[PDB]
Amino acid sequence: EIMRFKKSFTCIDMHTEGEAARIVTSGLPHIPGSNMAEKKAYLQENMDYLRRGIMLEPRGHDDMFGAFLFDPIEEGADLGIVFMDTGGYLNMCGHNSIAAVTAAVETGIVSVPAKATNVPVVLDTPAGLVRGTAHLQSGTESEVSNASIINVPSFLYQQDVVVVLPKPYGEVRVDIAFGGNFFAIVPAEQLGIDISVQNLSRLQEAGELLRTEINRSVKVQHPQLPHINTVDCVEIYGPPTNPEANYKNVVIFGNRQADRSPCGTGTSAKMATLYAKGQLRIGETFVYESILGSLFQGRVLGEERIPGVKVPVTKDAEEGMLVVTAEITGKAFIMGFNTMLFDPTDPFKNGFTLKQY
Amino acid sequence: KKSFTCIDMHTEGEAARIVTSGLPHIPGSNMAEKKAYLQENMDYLRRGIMLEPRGHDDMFGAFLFDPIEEGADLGIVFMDTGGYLNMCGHNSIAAVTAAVETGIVSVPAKATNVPVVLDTPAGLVRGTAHLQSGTESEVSNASIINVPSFLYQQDVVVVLPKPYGEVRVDIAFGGNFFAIVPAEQLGIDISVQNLSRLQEAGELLRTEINRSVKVQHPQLPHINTVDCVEIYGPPTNPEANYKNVVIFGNRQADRSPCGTGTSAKMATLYAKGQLRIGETFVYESILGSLFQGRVLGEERIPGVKVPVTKDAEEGMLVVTAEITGKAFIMGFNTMLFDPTDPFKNGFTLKQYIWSS
Ligand SMILES: *[C@H](C(=O)O)[C@@H]1CCCC1=O
Ligand SMILES: *[C@H](C(=O)O)[C@@H]1CCCC1=O
Numbered sequence: 090e091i092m093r094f095k096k097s098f099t100c101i102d103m104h105t106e107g108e109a110a111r112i113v114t115s116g117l118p119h120i121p122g123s124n125m126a127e128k129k130a131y132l133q134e135n136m137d138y139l140r141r142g143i144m145l146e147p148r149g150h151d152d153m154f155g156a157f158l159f160d161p162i163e164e165g166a167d168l169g170i171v172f173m174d175t176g177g178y179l180n181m182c183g184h185n186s187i188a189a190v191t192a193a194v195e196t197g198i199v200s201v202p203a204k205a206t207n208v209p210v211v212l213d214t215p216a217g218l219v220r221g222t223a224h225l226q227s228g229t230e231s232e233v234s235n236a237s238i239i240n241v242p243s244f245l246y247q248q249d250v251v252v253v254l255p256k257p258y259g260e261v262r263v264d265i266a267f268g269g270n271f272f273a274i275v276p277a278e279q280l281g282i283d284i285s286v287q288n289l290s291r292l293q294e295a296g297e298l299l300r301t302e303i304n305r306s307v308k309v310q311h312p313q314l315p316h317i318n319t320v321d322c323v324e325i326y327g328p329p330t331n332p333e334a335n336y337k338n339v340v341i342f343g344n345r346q347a348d349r350s351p352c353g354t355g356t357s358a359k360m361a362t363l364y365a366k367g368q369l370r371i372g373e374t375f376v377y378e379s380i381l382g383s384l385f386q387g388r389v390l391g392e393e394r395i396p397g398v399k400v401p402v403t404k405d406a407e408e409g410m411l412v413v414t415a416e417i418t419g420k421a422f423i424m425g426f427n428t429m430l431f432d433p434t435d436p437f438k439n440g441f442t443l444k445q446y
Numbered sequence: 447k448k449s450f451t452c453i454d455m456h457t458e459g460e461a462a463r464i465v466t467s468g469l470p471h472i473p474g475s476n477m478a479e480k481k482a483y484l485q486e487n488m489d490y491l492r493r494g495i496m497l498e499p500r501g502h503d504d505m506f507g508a509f510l511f512d513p514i515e516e517g518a519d520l521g522i523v524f525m526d527t528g529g530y531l532n533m534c535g536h537n538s539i540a541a542v543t544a545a546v547e548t549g550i551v552s553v554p555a556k557a558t559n560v561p562v563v564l565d566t567p568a569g570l571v572r573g574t575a576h577l578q579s580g581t582e583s584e585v586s587n588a589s590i591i592n593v594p595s596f597l598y599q600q601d602v603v604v605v606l607p608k609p610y611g612e613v614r615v616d617i618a619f620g621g622n623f624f625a626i627v628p629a630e631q632l633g634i635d636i637s638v639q640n641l642s643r644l645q646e647a648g649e650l651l652r653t654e655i656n657r658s659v660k661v662q663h664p665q666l667p668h669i670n671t672v673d674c675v676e677i678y679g680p681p682t683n684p685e686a687n688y689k690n691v692v693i694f695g696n697r698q699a700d701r702s703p704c705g706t707g708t709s710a711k712m713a714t715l716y717a718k719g720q721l722r723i724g725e726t727f728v729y730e731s732i733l734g735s736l737f738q739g740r741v742l743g744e745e746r747i748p749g750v751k752v753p754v755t756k757d758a759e760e761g762m763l764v765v766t767a768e769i770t771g772k773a774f775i776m777g778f779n780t781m782l783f784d785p786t787d788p789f790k791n792g793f794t795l796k797q798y799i800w801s802s
Contacts (some may be wrong), residue, residue, distance in 0.1 A: 093775075102779075104499035107789050146701075147456035148776050150502035286795050349498070349795075381793065422787045424500050427454075427779045435774045437459050441733065443638055443699075 093430065098143060100155070101196060102425040103188040106383035108350035110188035110421065111155030113143065116429075124162055126215040126316050129171045129178050132157070138439040140173045145440030148429055151175055152346050156185050158198075159213075166213035167199055175442065176343030180317055181216035181269030183238060183353010183385070188421040190221035190236040195423060201231045216269050216317070217241035235420040238353060239390065242412040243268045243361035246309060247401040252302050257281055258295060265309060268358030268415070270321040272340070273303050277327040284327045284337050286380060289347060296323035296341030312398050312410070324355045334378035344444055350419070351377040351385040357415040364389050364413055365402070386418040447785065450495065452507075453548060454777035455540040458735030460702035462540035462773065463495060463507035466548075476514055478532075481523045481567040484509070485530045490791045492525045497792025500781055503527055504698060508537045510550075511565075518565035519551050527794065528695040532669070533568040533621030535590065535705015535737075540773040542573035542588040547775065553583050562588075568621050569593045576770075587772040591742070594764040595620045595709040597717040598661065599753035604654050606647075609633060613651065617661060620710030620767070623672045624692075625655050629679035636679045636689055638732060641699055648675040648693025664750050664762070676707045686730035696798055702771070703729040703737040709767040716741050716765055717754070737771040 098116030102109070120136075122128035132140065144153045152175070159169030170189060172182045190210045193199045201208050210221040220239040226232040247265040250273075254261060263275040277284050282291045300323045311317035326338040340348040340355045348355070356377045363369035375387045396409040403410045431438045450468035454461075469491065474480030484491065496505045504527070511521030522541060524534040542562040545551050551562050557577065564571040572591045578584040599617045602625075606613055613631040618624050629636045632647045652675050663669040678690040692700040692707045700707070708729045715721040727739045746761035755762045783790045 102500070104789060107499055107793055109499050146504070147459055147461055148454070150504065152498070152502070287797055289795060289797075347795075380795070383788075422784050422789075423782055424787075425779055425781045427777050429777045430775050432774050435776070436735070437456065437774075441459060443641055443701075445639060445642075 094428070096431045098429045100427045100429060101192045101423060102427055103192060103421050104424050105184035105188050105419055105421040106350045106379060107381050108184050108348060109152070109154045110185045111143065111149070111153060112185075112189060112192050113155060113157045117157060120159070125159070125169050125171060125213050126180070128159060128169075129215045132171065133178055140178070141440040142431055142438055143429060144173060144175050145442050147437055148440065149175070151344070151442055151444050152349070154182070154185060156182070156189065161213045163213045163218055166211045166218060168193060168210065169213045171215060174343050175346055179270050179321055181214050181219065181241060181354050183240070183269065183356065183417050184348070184350040184419065184421070186212055186214070186219050186221065186238045187236045187353060187417075187419045190223050190238065191233045191421040192423065194223040194231055194233050197231070201225070216314070235418060237416055237418045240354065240357045240415045240417060241269055242393070243357040243415050244400065244410060244412040245362045245365040245402050246271065247307070250307065252299060252306065254298050254302060258298070261299065263299070264362050265307065265320065266358035266362045267311060268356070268361065269354035271309050271317070271319065272322045272324045272355055272358040273299060273320050274324045274326065274359060274362060275299065277325045280325070284325065284339055284380065289339070289380065292325055292339055293341055293345045293347050296325060297345040299323050300341070312400060322355065324352065324359065326359070329378050331378045331382060331384060334376045334384060337378035337380070339380045344442070347380070349379060349381055351379040351383060353385060353417040353419065356385050356387045356417050360387055360389055360415050361413045364392070365411055388416050390414045390416050448783040450781045452495070452779040452781055453544045453775060454779050455544055455773045456776050457536040457540050457771055457773040458702045458731060459733050460536045460700060461504065461506045462537040463501065463505060464537070464541055464544050465495065465507065465509045469509055472511070477511070477521050477523065477565050478567040480511060480521070481530050481532070484523060492530060493792045494783060494790060495781060496525060496527050497794050499789055500792060501527070503794060503796050504701070506534070506537060508534070508541060513565040515565040515570055518563045518570060520545060520562065521565045523567060526695060526698070528698070533566055533571070533593065533706055535592070535621065535708065535769055536700070536702045536771070538564055538571050538573060538590045539588045539705065539769075539771050542575050542590065543585045543773040544775065546575035546577070546583050547585050549583065553577070587770055589768050589770040590705060591766060591768045592706065592709040593621050594745070595713040595767050596752065596762060596764045597714050597754050598623070599659065602655070602659060604651060604658065606650055606654055610647065610650070615651070615655070616714050617659065617672065618710035618714050619663065620708070620713065621706035622674055623661060623663075623669070624674045624676045624707055624710040625651065625672050626676045626678065626711060626714055627651065629677045632677065636677065636691060636732060641691070641732070644677055644691055645693055645697040645699060648677065649697060651675055652693075664752055674707065676704065676711065678711070681730050683730050683734060683736065686728045686736055689730040689732070691732045696796065699732065701731065701733055703731040703735060705737060705769045705771070708737050708739050708769050712739050712741055712767045713765045716744070717763060737769055739767055739769045742766045742768055
C-alpha cells in the first residue's frame with residue numbers, strides 16, 4: 090500500500106468551458122531552477138516522461154491539458170505554475186490560469202478574508218506574473234463564481250504577414266501577436282473553412298500547416314524574454330454565433346490539438362491586435378466565442394510604449410513598441426479529485442498516443 | 447452536487463473506469479433490466495463519466511451493483527462513449543482485478559487464486575484473480591471464463607467499394623457479435639499508422655455485412671446485429687499466434703487484444719479444427735500487448751442451430767473459452783458534478799462522417 094502510492098501524483102481535475110485543466114498539487118520532487126521558466130526547462134529536459142504519463146492515454150487523452158503547481162518564487166506571487174499539454178509546455182495558458190485561481194480559493198490554497206467578495210491570487214508563470222482575481226458567489230464562504238486574470242503584457246508583433254501554403258489554401262495573410270504565447274491570427278474565411286465542429290479536422294489541419302510554414306519563414310523573439318521564440322499557437326477567427334460575442338475562434342496548437350475554450354492568451358493577443366489597429370478602445374468589453382458556444386470576456390486596461398525597444402510592426406517613425414495590459418474573464422469548475430498511480434511494471438506508465446506523427 | 451468514486455483502471459492501454467460508489471438507486475430484477483433502465487432513463491450518468499471533460503472519446507467503463515443472479519459476487523453494467531453494453535472482456539478483467547486489489551471480495555487465507563463472479567447483462571462471467579507469490583492481495587493477472595461462444599456463419603464473401611472489392615469474413619459470437627476478417631483481405635497492414643484506414647474499412651465492411659446478412663442470437667432475440675469488426679494478421683511478438691484490432695462504435699478501435707474478440711476468434715479456429723481444447727492461444731494488440739486464451743470445452747445445443755450448423759448436426763456447436771490478461775490501477779478518482787456546470791453531462795466533438 091505504501092509501495093502502491095510510490096511515484097503517485099495528486100490532482101484537482103478541472104475544466105474551463107469544457108477545456109481540461111489537470112492541476113497537479115503534489116507528487117513532484119524538488120525541481121532545480123531559480124525561476125519558473127528554468128523549472129519548466131528542467132522538466133522538459135530531464136523529466137518529460139512525467140508530462141507524458143499525466144497527459145496522455147490511458148490516464149489522459151490526446152486533448153488533455155494541465156499544470157504543475159510550485160511554491161512561488163517571485164515577490165508578491167501566491168503560487169508558482171508550469172503548464173503542460175500532450176505536445177510540450179506552454180509559457181502561459183489563460184484557461185488553466187483561470188482554473189488555477191478558482192482551485193486555489195475553492196480548495197483553500199489561498200485564504201479568503203472574512204466577508205470578502207473578491208480574492209486575489211497571483212501566479213508566477215514562465216511568461217511572467219499573472220494577477221488573478223477570484224470573484225466569490227454572494228452568500229458562500231469560498232465558492233467561486235468566476236475568475237479574472239490580468240495577463241502579462243501583450244502586443245502586436247508583425248502585421249499583414251503573407252504565408253504560402255499548399256492547396257486549397259495558398260496565400261494567407263496573418264498577424265503575429267503575443268498574449269502569453271505567440272499566436273498567428275488568421276480569419277477562417279482566408280482558409281475556405283467556416284468555423285464549426287463539423288469542420289474541425291479541416292481547421293486542425295489548416296493550422297498545423299500554417300504554423301510550420303510560419304516557424305520556418307518567420308523568426309520571432311520576445312524582446313524582454315529570451316526563452317520565448319517560436320509561434321506556439323494559431324488562432325482562427327470568424328463571425329460570432331452567440332449574439333453576445335464579437336467573434337468566434339478556435340486555437341490550434343501542439344500535436345494539432347484544438348483548444349475547447351475561447352482561449353485566454355489568444356483573447357489577449359486578439360485584443361492587443363485590435364487595439365493597435367484602433368478597432369478596440371481602452372476599457373471596452375470584448376467577448377470571444379469558442380467552438381462549443383462558450384464565452385470569455387476581456388478588456389484592455391492600459392497601454393504603454395516601451396522606448397528603445399522594437400518589434401517588426403514598430404515603425405521607423407516610432408520610439409518604442411506598444412504593449413497592452415489585458416484582462417480576461419471566464420468560469421472554471423472542479424470535476425474531480427484524483428490520485429494518479431504509476432506502477433513501475435505498467436508498460437503504459439509513461440502514456441501513449443495513437444495520433445499520427 | 448453529485449459525487450462518484452471510481453477506480454480508474456486500464457487493461458493493456460484500454461480504459462476501465464469502474465464506478466464503486468455514489469450512483470443513484472437503479473431498479474431491475476436482473477442485470478439486463480438494470481442496463482435497460484440505465485439506457486432508457488439515466489443515460490446522463492454514462493455521458494458525464496465517459497465523455498469529455500471527465501472522460502474522452504475512447505473512455506470505457508462500468509457501474510458496480512449488488513449481484514442478483516445466484517452465485518455472483520458483483521453486478522455490473524458496461525458502457526462506452528456510444529452507449530451502455532452487455533459484455534466487455536477487458537473491463538471484466540479489470541473489475542475482477544479491482545475487486546480483489548481493493549478488497550471488494552475476500553481473500554481466503556493462503557490462497558493463490560480468488561474467484562470473482564460477475565453478474566452481467568449477458569449472463570454470469572466467472573473470473574479468477576491470480577495472486578502474486580506471497581502477497582495479501584496483489585493481483586498478477588486475471589482470467590475470465592466468457593459466456594458461451596460460437597462460430598455463427600462462415601466464409602461470408604463481401605463486395606466492398608474499391609480499393610477493397612472482394613473480402614471474405616467469418617461471423618462469430620464471444621459475448622458480442624464479430625465479423626472476423628484478415629487484414630490481408632483489406633490490403634492494409636495492421637499498425638498504428640494505418641489505424642485511420644482500418645477504422646474506415648471496419649465501417650464500410652460492417653455496413654455491407656449488416657445489409658447483406660441479418661444475424662440472430664438463437665437464445666436471445668434482441669442481440670441481433672454485428673457492431674464489431676475484428677481485423678487480424680501476422681503477429682509481431684513471437685509469443686503471439688496472431689495480432690488484431692477490433693473496430694466498433696463510431697470509428698473506435700480497441701487498444702487491447704479484446705477479450706470477447708479473442709473468445710470469438712478461438713470459437714472460429716476451434717470449429718475449423720485449428721485449435722485444440724486446452725491449447726494456449728495468444729493474441730496481440732495493435733500496441734503489442736497480449737491476452738492468453740484456452741478453449742476449455744465444447745457443447746452441443748440440441749434443436750438449436752445457426753447458418754454454419756450443418757444439416758444433421760441436431761445442435762449448434764458452442765465453446766467455453768477462458769481469457770487471461772493484466773489490468774493496472776491508474777487512479778482513485780472522485781468525480782464531481784456541479785449542478786450549474788454546463789458540461790456536467792459531458793460533450794463530444796466527434797462527428798459521424800456521412801456522404802450523399
Ligand atoms: C488558450 C489559453 O491560453 O487559454 C491557449 C491556446 C492553447 C492552450 C493555451 O494556452
Ligand atoms: C473487446 C472485449 O471484449 O474486451 C470488445 C470489443 C468492443 C468493446 C469490447 O469490450
